[PDB]
Short mmCIF file of C-alpha atoms and ligand atoms in Angstrom, two decimals:
data_model
loop_
_atom_site.label_atom_id
_atom_site.label_comp_id
_atom_site.label_asym_id
_atom_site.label_seq_id
_atom_site.Cartn_x
_atom_site.Cartn_y
_atom_site.Cartn_z
CA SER A 27 -70.06 -8.66 -252.17
CA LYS A 28 -67.51 -5.87 -252.63
CA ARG A 29 -68.64 -4.12 -249.44
CA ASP A 30 -67.96 -7.18 -247.37
CA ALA A 31 -64.61 -7.84 -249.00
CA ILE A 32 -63.61 -4.21 -248.10
CA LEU A 33 -64.66 -4.67 -244.55
CA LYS A 34 -62.77 -7.95 -244.30
CA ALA A 35 -59.68 -6.35 -245.77
CA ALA A 36 -60.03 -3.41 -243.38
CA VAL A 37 -60.22 -5.78 -240.30
CA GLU A 38 -57.02 -7.56 -241.45
CA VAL A 39 -55.04 -4.39 -242.36
CA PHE A 40 -56.23 -2.17 -239.40
CA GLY A 41 -55.40 -5.10 -237.03
CA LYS A 42 -51.79 -5.72 -238.55
CA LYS A 43 -50.77 -2.08 -238.89
CA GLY A 44 -52.97 -0.08 -236.43
CA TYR A 45 -55.41 2.63 -237.22
CA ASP A 46 -53.00 5.49 -237.93
CA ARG A 47 -50.66 3.70 -240.28
CA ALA A 48 -53.19 1.80 -242.21
CA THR A 49 -54.36 3.33 -245.57
CA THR A 50 -57.44 2.91 -247.63
CA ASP A 51 -55.22 2.12 -250.55
CA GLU A 52 -53.72 -0.83 -248.59
CA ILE A 53 -57.21 -2.00 -247.83
CA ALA A 54 -58.39 -1.73 -251.28
CA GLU A 55 -55.54 -3.78 -252.82
CA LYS A 56 -55.92 -6.41 -249.92
CA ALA A 57 -59.64 -6.56 -250.92
CA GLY A 58 -58.80 -6.74 -254.65
CA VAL A 59 -60.95 -3.56 -255.59
CA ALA A 60 -60.28 -0.11 -257.17
CA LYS A 61 -58.75 2.42 -254.79
CA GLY A 62 -61.70 4.78 -255.32
CA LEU A 63 -64.27 2.03 -254.65
CA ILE A 64 -63.60 2.40 -250.91
CA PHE A 65 -65.05 5.94 -251.04
CA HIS A 66 -68.15 4.74 -253.04
CA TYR A 67 -69.15 2.72 -249.73
CA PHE A 68 -67.39 4.63 -247.00
CA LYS A 69 -67.30 8.38 -246.73
CA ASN A 70 -63.72 8.16 -245.33
CA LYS A 71 -61.16 6.17 -243.33
CA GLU A 72 -62.83 6.95 -239.97
CA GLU A 73 -66.18 5.74 -241.20
CA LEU A 74 -64.52 2.65 -242.80
CA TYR A 75 -62.97 1.83 -239.44
CA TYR A 76 -66.26 2.56 -237.59
CA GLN A 77 -68.32 0.33 -239.88
CA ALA A 78 -65.80 -2.48 -239.63
CA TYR A 79 -65.70 -2.31 -235.95
CA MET A 80 -69.50 -2.29 -235.66
CA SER A 81 -69.72 -5.09 -238.12
CA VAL A 82 -67.37 -7.21 -235.93
CA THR A 83 -69.05 -6.36 -232.60
CA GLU A 84 -72.52 -6.90 -233.91
CA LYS A 85 -71.67 -10.39 -234.90
CA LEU A 86 -70.05 -10.96 -231.59
CA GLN A 87 -73.18 -9.39 -229.83
CA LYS A 88 -75.58 -11.82 -231.73
CA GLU A 89 -73.37 -14.75 -230.50
CA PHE A 90 -73.59 -13.36 -226.85
CA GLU A 91 -77.38 -13.22 -227.09
CA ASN A 92 -77.61 -16.77 -228.34
CA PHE A 93 -75.20 -17.99 -225.66
CA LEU A 94 -77.27 -15.96 -223.09
CA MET A 95 -80.58 -17.70 -224.16
CA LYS A 96 -78.89 -21.05 -223.62
CA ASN A 97 -76.91 -20.36 -220.43
CA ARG A 98 -79.15 -17.84 -218.60
CA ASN A 99 -80.07 -20.27 -215.75
CA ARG A 100 -76.32 -21.09 -214.76
CA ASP A 101 -75.21 -19.05 -211.83
CA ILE A 102 -73.14 -16.05 -212.73
CA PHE A 103 -69.69 -17.39 -212.11
CA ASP A 104 -70.32 -20.41 -214.40
CA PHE A 105 -71.97 -18.21 -216.90
CA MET A 106 -69.08 -15.71 -217.03
CA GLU A 107 -66.47 -18.51 -217.04
CA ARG A 108 -68.23 -20.12 -220.09
CA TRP A 109 -68.62 -16.70 -221.97
CA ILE A 110 -64.84 -16.03 -221.36
CA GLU A 111 -64.20 -19.52 -222.74
CA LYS A 112 -66.09 -18.62 -225.95
CA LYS A 113 -64.22 -15.32 -226.27
CA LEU A 114 -60.90 -17.19 -225.80
CA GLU A 115 -62.18 -19.68 -228.54
CA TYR A 116 -63.10 -16.96 -230.81
CA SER A 117 -59.82 -15.14 -230.45
CA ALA A 118 -57.81 -18.37 -231.23
CA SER A 119 -60.01 -18.97 -234.25
CA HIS A 120 -60.16 -15.41 -235.47
CA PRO A 121 -56.78 -13.68 -234.47
CA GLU A 122 -57.13 -11.09 -237.07
CA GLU A 123 -60.49 -9.95 -235.69
CA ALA A 124 -59.12 -9.94 -232.25
CA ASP A 125 -56.13 -7.96 -233.16
CA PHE A 126 -58.54 -5.75 -235.08
CA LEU A 127 -60.67 -5.01 -231.96
CA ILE A 128 -57.69 -4.23 -229.72
CA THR A 129 -56.54 -1.41 -232.19
CA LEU A 130 -59.31 0.67 -230.58
CA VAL A 131 -57.01 1.92 -227.85
CA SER A 132 -54.72 3.71 -230.50
CA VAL A 133 -57.47 5.12 -232.71
CA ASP A 134 -57.77 8.92 -232.89
CA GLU A 135 -59.52 10.36 -229.85
CA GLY A 136 -62.69 11.58 -231.56
CA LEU A 137 -63.51 8.24 -233.32
CA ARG A 138 -62.28 6.21 -230.30
CA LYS A 139 -64.71 7.99 -227.87
CA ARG A 140 -67.46 7.56 -230.38
CA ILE A 141 -67.04 3.77 -230.69
CA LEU A 142 -66.35 3.45 -226.81
CA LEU A 143 -69.75 5.04 -226.28
CA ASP A 144 -71.39 2.60 -228.80
CA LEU A 145 -69.91 -0.29 -227.03
CA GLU A 146 -71.05 0.89 -223.51
CA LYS A 147 -74.58 0.61 -224.99
CA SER A 148 -74.18 -3.21 -224.59
CA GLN A 149 -71.79 -3.46 -221.85
CA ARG A 150 -74.35 -1.61 -219.55
CA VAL A 151 -76.81 -4.42 -220.43
CA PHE A 152 -74.41 -7.17 -219.60
CA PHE A 153 -73.43 -5.28 -216.37
CA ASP A 154 -77.24 -5.27 -215.44
CA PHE A 155 -77.64 -8.98 -216.16
CA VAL A 156 -74.62 -9.43 -213.84
CA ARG A 157 -76.44 -7.37 -211.13
CA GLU A 158 -79.66 -9.31 -211.51
CA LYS A 159 -77.82 -12.61 -211.26
CA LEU A 160 -76.11 -11.39 -208.13
CA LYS A 161 -79.47 -10.83 -206.42
CA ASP A 162 -80.18 -14.60 -206.98
CA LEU A 163 -77.23 -15.40 -204.69
CA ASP A 164 -76.72 -15.38 -200.88
CA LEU A 165 -73.78 -13.02 -200.68
CA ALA A 166 -71.12 -13.64 -198.05
CA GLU A 167 -70.91 -11.40 -195.00
CA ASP A 168 -69.79 -7.81 -196.01
CA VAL A 169 -69.95 -8.64 -199.64
CA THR A 170 -72.32 -6.01 -200.97
CA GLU A 171 -73.85 -6.22 -204.49
CA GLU A 172 -71.86 -3.00 -205.58
CA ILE A 173 -68.50 -4.55 -204.45
CA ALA A 174 -69.45 -8.00 -206.00
CA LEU A 175 -70.33 -6.26 -209.20
CA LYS A 176 -67.27 -3.93 -209.25
CA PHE A 177 -64.92 -6.75 -208.67
CA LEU A 178 -66.56 -9.08 -211.29
CA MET A 179 -66.69 -6.37 -213.88
CA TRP A 180 -63.07 -5.50 -213.28
CA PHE A 181 -62.12 -9.12 -213.50
CA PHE A 182 -64.05 -9.49 -216.76
CA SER A 183 -62.67 -6.26 -218.26
CA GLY A 184 -59.18 -7.57 -217.82
CA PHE A 185 -59.59 -9.94 -220.89
CA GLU A 186 -58.62 -7.00 -223.24
CA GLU A 187 -55.80 -5.92 -221.41
CA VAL A 188 -54.14 -9.29 -221.15
CA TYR A 189 -54.69 -9.71 -224.91
CA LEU A 190 -53.19 -6.30 -225.78
CA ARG A 191 -50.20 -7.10 -223.47
CA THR A 192 -49.50 -10.73 -224.35
CA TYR A 193 -51.31 -12.09 -227.59
CA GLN A 194 -51.67 -9.15 -230.01
CA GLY A 195 -49.90 -10.32 -233.16
CA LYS A 196 -48.96 -13.73 -231.59
CA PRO A 197 -51.58 -16.16 -232.89
CA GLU A 198 -49.36 -19.26 -232.26
CA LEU A 199 -48.74 -18.23 -228.60
CA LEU A 200 -52.43 -17.81 -227.97
CA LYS A 201 -53.29 -21.10 -229.43
CA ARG A 202 -50.45 -22.64 -227.36
CA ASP A 203 -51.82 -21.11 -224.24
CA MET A 204 -55.67 -21.41 -224.80
CA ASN A 205 -56.55 -24.51 -222.78
CA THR A 206 -54.35 -23.30 -219.95
CA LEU A 207 -56.05 -19.84 -219.84
CA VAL A 208 -59.33 -21.46 -219.69
CA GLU A 209 -58.29 -23.77 -216.92
CA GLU A 210 -56.91 -20.65 -215.01
CA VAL A 211 -60.06 -18.71 -215.58
CA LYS A 212 -62.11 -21.50 -214.08
CA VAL A 213 -60.00 -21.55 -210.97
CA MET A 214 -60.16 -17.73 -210.59
CA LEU A 215 -63.92 -17.74 -211.00
CA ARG A 216 -64.20 -20.60 -208.42
CA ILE A 217 -62.11 -18.36 -206.05
CA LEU A 218 -64.44 -15.47 -206.50
CA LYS A 219 -67.49 -17.56 -206.11
CA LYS A 220 -66.32 -19.20 -202.83
CA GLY A 221 -65.20 -15.80 -201.46
CA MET A 222 -68.32 -13.80 -202.52
CA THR A 223 -71.03 -16.21 -201.51
CA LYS A 224 -72.09 -17.63 -198.04
CA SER B 77 -31.08 23.05 -202.28
CA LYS B 78 -31.71 24.21 -205.78
CA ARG B 79 -31.65 20.59 -207.13
CA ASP B 80 -34.35 19.52 -204.68
CA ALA B 81 -36.43 22.62 -205.63
CA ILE B 82 -35.95 21.75 -209.35
CA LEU B 83 -37.00 18.11 -208.69
CA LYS B 84 -40.05 19.26 -206.74
CA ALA B 85 -41.04 21.64 -209.46
CA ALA B 86 -40.53 18.88 -212.02
CA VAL B 87 -42.99 16.59 -210.17
CA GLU B 88 -45.59 19.35 -210.03
CA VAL B 89 -45.30 20.46 -213.71
CA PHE B 90 -44.83 17.04 -215.30
CA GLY B 91 -47.77 15.83 -213.18
CA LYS B 92 -50.04 18.75 -214.23
CA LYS B 93 -49.14 18.87 -217.92
CA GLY B 94 -47.79 15.53 -218.81
CA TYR B 95 -44.18 14.70 -220.07
CA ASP B 96 -44.58 15.84 -223.71
CA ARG B 97 -45.99 19.29 -223.00
CA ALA B 98 -43.92 20.12 -219.85
CA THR B 99 -40.85 22.32 -220.60
CA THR B 100 -37.80 22.91 -218.46
CA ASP B 101 -38.44 26.45 -218.59
CA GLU B 102 -41.81 26.07 -216.83
CA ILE B 103 -40.10 23.93 -214.25
CA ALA B 104 -37.30 26.48 -213.72
CA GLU B 105 -39.81 29.36 -213.08
CA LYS B 106 -41.94 26.97 -210.90
CA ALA B 107 -38.76 26.25 -208.82
CA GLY B 108 -37.89 29.96 -208.85
CA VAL B 109 -34.30 29.46 -210.51
CA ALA B 110 -32.63 30.55 -213.66
CA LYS B 111 -33.55 28.66 -216.87
CA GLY B 112 -30.06 27.44 -217.56
CA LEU B 113 -29.73 26.12 -214.00
CA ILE B 114 -31.75 23.10 -215.00
CA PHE B 115 -28.95 22.11 -217.42
CA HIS B 116 -26.29 22.59 -214.84
CA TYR B 117 -27.84 19.71 -212.81
CA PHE B 118 -29.61 17.71 -215.44
CA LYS B 119 -28.21 16.87 -218.91
CA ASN B 120 -31.73 17.22 -220.45
CA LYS B 121 -35.53 16.97 -219.92
CA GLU B 122 -35.37 13.25 -220.18
CA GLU B 123 -32.75 12.98 -217.39
CA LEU B 124 -34.71 15.54 -215.37
CA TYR B 125 -37.86 13.36 -215.72
CA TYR B 126 -35.90 10.22 -214.97
CA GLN B 127 -34.21 11.66 -211.74
CA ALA B 128 -37.46 13.05 -210.63
CA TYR B 129 -39.17 9.68 -211.12
CA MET B 130 -36.26 7.80 -209.48
CA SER B 131 -36.30 10.31 -206.56
CA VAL B 132 -39.98 9.76 -205.79
CA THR B 133 -39.99 5.88 -206.18
CA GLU B 134 -36.88 5.60 -203.97
CA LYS B 135 -38.62 7.36 -201.12
CA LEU B 136 -41.62 5.22 -201.66
CA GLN B 137 -39.40 2.06 -201.75
CA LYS B 138 -37.83 3.03 -198.43
CA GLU B 139 -41.44 3.36 -196.96
CA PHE B 140 -42.31 0.02 -198.29
CA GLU B 141 -39.15 -1.60 -196.75
CA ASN B 142 -40.03 0.07 -193.34
CA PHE B 143 -43.63 -1.21 -193.59
CA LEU B 144 -42.35 -4.67 -194.60
CA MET B 145 -40.07 -4.90 -191.55
CA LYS B 146 -43.09 -4.05 -189.44
CA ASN B 147 -45.78 -6.25 -191.14
CA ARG B 148 -43.90 -9.06 -192.54
CA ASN B 149 -45.63 -11.70 -190.15
CA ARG B 150 -49.10 -10.80 -191.18
CA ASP B 151 -50.58 -13.11 -193.75
CA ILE B 152 -50.30 -11.87 -197.28
CA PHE B 153 -53.85 -10.66 -197.69
CA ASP B 154 -53.65 -8.58 -194.59
CA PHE B 155 -50.29 -7.36 -195.55
CA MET B 156 -51.29 -6.32 -199.05
CA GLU B 157 -54.56 -4.71 -197.94
CA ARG B 158 -52.48 -2.60 -195.46
CA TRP B 159 -49.92 -1.68 -198.02
CA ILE B 160 -52.69 -0.68 -200.48
CA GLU B 161 -54.16 1.47 -197.55
CA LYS B 162 -50.77 3.25 -197.22
CA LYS B 163 -50.55 3.92 -201.03
CA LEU B 164 -54.16 5.30 -200.84
CA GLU B 165 -53.09 7.60 -197.92
CA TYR B 166 -50.07 8.70 -199.84
CA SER B 167 -52.02 9.48 -202.90
CA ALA B 168 -54.66 11.61 -200.90
CA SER B 169 -51.80 13.50 -199.15
CA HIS B 170 -49.49 13.85 -202.08
CA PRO B 171 -51.75 14.18 -205.16
CA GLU B 172 -49.11 15.93 -207.19
CA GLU B 173 -46.63 13.11 -206.76
CA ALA B 174 -49.42 10.45 -207.57
CA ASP B 175 -50.38 12.63 -210.56
CA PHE B 176 -46.59 12.65 -211.48
CA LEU B 177 -46.09 8.95 -211.25
CA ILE B 178 -49.10 8.10 -213.64
CA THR B 179 -47.53 10.35 -216.40
CA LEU B 180 -45.15 7.48 -217.12
CA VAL B 181 -47.64 5.75 -219.47
CA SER B 182 -47.52 8.76 -221.81
CA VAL B 183 -43.72 9.31 -221.61
CA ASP B 184 -41.57 8.83 -224.92
CA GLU B 185 -41.07 5.22 -225.62
CA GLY B 186 -37.43 5.10 -224.92
CA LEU B 187 -37.53 6.73 -221.48
CA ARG B 188 -40.64 4.95 -220.55
CA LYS B 189 -39.03 1.52 -221.16
CA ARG B 190 -36.00 2.53 -219.39
CA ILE B 191 -37.89 3.58 -216.25
CA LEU B 192 -40.38 0.46 -216.51
CA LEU B 193 -37.31 -1.67 -216.37
CA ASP B 194 -36.00 0.00 -213.36
CA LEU B 195 -39.17 -0.37 -211.56
CA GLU B 196 -39.34 -4.10 -212.38
CA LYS B 197 -36.14 -4.41 -210.21
CA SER B 198 -38.39 -3.81 -207.17
CA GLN B 199 -41.61 -5.35 -208.35
CA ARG B 200 -39.81 -8.82 -208.92
CA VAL B 201 -38.76 -8.56 -205.37
CA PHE B 202 -42.22 -7.92 -203.95
CA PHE B 203 -43.65 -10.58 -206.30
CA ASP B 204 -41.15 -12.89 -204.74
CA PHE B 205 -42.16 -11.94 -201.18
CA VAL B 206 -45.82 -12.67 -202.21
CA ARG B 207 -44.75 -16.12 -203.65
CA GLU B 208 -42.97 -16.86 -200.36
CA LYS B 209 -45.92 -15.76 -198.19
CA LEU B 210 -48.20 -18.07 -200.41
CA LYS B 211 -46.07 -21.05 -199.44
CA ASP B 212 -47.03 -20.43 -195.65
CA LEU B 213 -50.68 -20.93 -196.55
CA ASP B 214 -52.79 -24.06 -196.92
CA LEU B 215 -54.23 -23.39 -200.52
CA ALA B 216 -57.70 -24.38 -201.63
CA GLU B 217 -58.26 -27.22 -203.93
CA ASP B 218 -57.03 -26.46 -207.40
CA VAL B 219 -55.60 -23.14 -206.44
CA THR B 220 -52.02 -23.47 -207.36
CA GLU B 221 -49.25 -21.08 -206.30
CA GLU B 222 -48.95 -19.81 -209.82
CA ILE B 223 -52.60 -19.01 -210.16
CA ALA B 224 -52.77 -17.41 -206.64
CA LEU B 225 -49.75 -15.35 -207.44
CA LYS B 226 -50.92 -14.29 -210.91
CA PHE B 227 -54.38 -13.25 -209.45
CA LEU B 228 -52.98 -11.37 -206.61
CA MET B 229 -50.46 -9.45 -208.65
CA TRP B 230 -53.27 -8.60 -211.23
CA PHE B 231 -55.35 -7.28 -208.37
CA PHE B 232 -52.47 -5.32 -206.94
CA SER B 233 -51.44 -3.95 -210.42
CA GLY B 234 -54.93 -2.54 -210.83
CA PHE B 235 -54.24 0.29 -208.42
CA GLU B 236 -52.58 2.51 -211.08
CA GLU B 237 -55.17 1.80 -213.67
CA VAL B 238 -58.05 2.92 -211.42
CA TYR B 239 -56.01 5.98 -210.55
CA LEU B 240 -55.43 7.09 -214.01
CA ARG B 241 -58.99 6.45 -214.97
CA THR B 242 -60.73 8.10 -212.02
CA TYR B 243 -58.47 10.25 -209.84
CA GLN B 244 -55.71 11.72 -211.96
CA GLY B 245 -56.06 15.54 -211.59
CA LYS B 246 -59.02 15.02 -209.18
CA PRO B 247 -57.61 15.50 -205.63
CA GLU B 248 -60.96 16.35 -204.09
CA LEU B 249 -62.61 13.33 -205.37
CA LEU B 250 -59.90 10.93 -204.19
CA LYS B 251 -60.06 12.51 -200.75
CA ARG B 252 -63.93 12.07 -200.87
CA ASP B 253 -63.56 8.46 -201.70
CA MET B 254 -60.48 7.34 -199.75
CA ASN B 255 -62.11 5.61 -196.79
CA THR B 256 -64.64 3.88 -198.94
CA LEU B 257 -61.92 2.59 -201.38
CA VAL B 258 -60.16 1.17 -198.26
CA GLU B 259 -63.24 -0.44 -197.07
CA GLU B 260 -63.76 -1.97 -200.62
CA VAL B 261 -60.20 -3.15 -200.87
CA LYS B 262 -60.52 -4.97 -197.47
CA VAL B 263 -63.62 -6.84 -198.67
CA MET B 264 -62.07 -7.78 -202.03
CA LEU B 265 -59.09 -9.25 -200.24
CA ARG B 266 -61.08 -11.06 -197.88
CA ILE B 267 -62.97 -12.50 -200.95
CA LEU B 268 -59.67 -13.67 -202.36
CA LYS B 269 -58.47 -15.00 -199.11
CA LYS B 270 -61.61 -17.10 -198.44
CA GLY B 271 -61.57 -18.29 -202.10
CA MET B 272 -57.87 -19.16 -202.29
CA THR B 273 -57.26 -20.84 -199.06
CA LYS B 274 -58.64 -24.03 -197.45
C1 LIG C 236 -52.51 -11.02 -215.33
C2 LIG C 236 -52.87 -12.43 -214.98
C3 LIG C 236 -54.34 -12.40 -214.46
C4 LIG C 236 -55.26 -11.79 -215.57
C5 LIG C 236 -56.74 -12.46 -215.40
C6 LIG C 236 -57.47 -11.95 -216.70
C7 LIG C 236 -59.04 -11.98 -216.44
C8 LIG C 236 -59.82 -12.69 -217.46
O1 LIG C 236 -60.94 -11.81 -217.80
C1 LIG C 237 -56.46 -13.60 -224.73
C2 LIG C 237 -56.11 -13.30 -223.30
C3 LIG C 237 -57.42 -13.24 -222.35
C4 LIG C 237 -57.47 -14.41 -221.45
C5 LIG C 237 -57.21 -13.86 -220.03
C6 LIG C 237 -57.12 -15.01 -218.97
C7 LIG C 237 -55.99 -14.88 -218.12
C8 LIG C 237 -55.80 -16.03 -217.02
O1 LIG C 237 -54.51 -16.32 -216.79
C1 LIG C 238 -62.80 -1.13 -211.11
C2 LIG C 238 -63.18 -1.47 -209.64
C3 LIG C 238 -62.31 -2.51 -209.12
C4 LIG C 238 -60.78 -2.20 -209.01
C5 LIG C 238 -60.10 -2.73 -207.82
C6 LIG C 238 -58.68 -2.15 -207.87
C7 LIG C 238 -57.62 -3.03 -207.15
C8 LIG C 238 -56.84 -2.32 -205.96
O1 LIG C 238 -55.37 -2.68 -206.35
C1 LIG C 239 -56.41 5.71 -206.22
C2 LIG C 239 -57.24 4.54 -206.78
C3 LIG C 239 -56.67 3.12 -206.25
C4 LIG C 239 -57.63 2.40 -205.35
C5 LIG C 239 -58.30 1.28 -206.02
C6 LIG C 239 -59.20 0.58 -205.07
C7 LIG C 239 -60.53 0.38 -205.82
C8 LIG C 239 -61.48 -0.48 -205.10
O1 LIG C 239 -62.93 0.03 -205.41
#
């Protein structure tokens, strides 16, 4: 469908050039459609970006729910390591999508806040699953639930920052590093498990 | 001295308004000196910012070296927790300086890179002290020196990001939270110690 081709082109072009410098015309020629056809489907550039962004994050969210159904009984450290492994695999296999998602930090303030608010409406869910899994554990002395959860969420939140800093626009480098990043994530989560639990 | 008054005014105004929106004229009236007197001492706004920034980081660096002379025999987790405690104390007592330092992320690219390079010329030192202290320890199974060091440096590097996100421009809130942040840093470093070592 033409709408899907436009969305796919938008992911590619926004991810290569950034929000500000990408144009709807570039997206339209990349999708192989007429320049006005963007505006048939999408009110403007902002809504094009937003719909692309929501399209990608929805697909990801469905994958996370499938994974969650299948790994819910693992302890949280194992669960999180496995999910991070999946995101690392997704990023190496869909570099343009990953490059697309990280352009959010340089989107216009109004659109960016709008999207950051939408994303919180799944992050506060995961956050709560983490909190619940934490109650299943016998926590080490002085390790409160609030500290365990802060620290784990800060660890998890650092995925995007590493990506932006090191792998954005470098698909070959991430492919080269993928298995080693997985190996390091496992050790770091084992460090946190051993330190947080009795 | 007039130069010191200008530098102090620059810290205050750059920290309140940001690099881009601050003017030398604002700085000059804040310092109580003539508008041209800035340019007697400082070639331009960029050099004014740079000299202010180097003035603050130098003072901090001297404090870090004093601390290092006095705490070098502590293990690294204790050493780092104590240094973080000092920076938290410095930030609560010098909010305007802390607000000043965090404006670096929104400085013009050329000046920002220049300063980020200068700061690396002390961060690579601390980094190496951390590496050396790590060799004194018996590391836990699979915890390599490179992983221990990556993880600890990422932990330590998160100070500035929390500040920017939560305490920039909110001196009362940081004062309110200071002792609790210290208490949480201690537990987090104890988590890392227990997990990283045998
Ligand atoms: C900067 C090296 C350590 C970053 C670990 C990233 C956490 C994975 O979510
Ligand atoms: C694509 C980058 C995210 C993975 C972060 C894991 C870093 C551990 O060294
Ligand atoms: C976002 C809550 C955890 C941040 C811990 C910050 C590390 C202190 O350098
Ligand atoms: C001024 C903010 C830096 C302190 C970060 C410690 C966060 C632990 O909750």
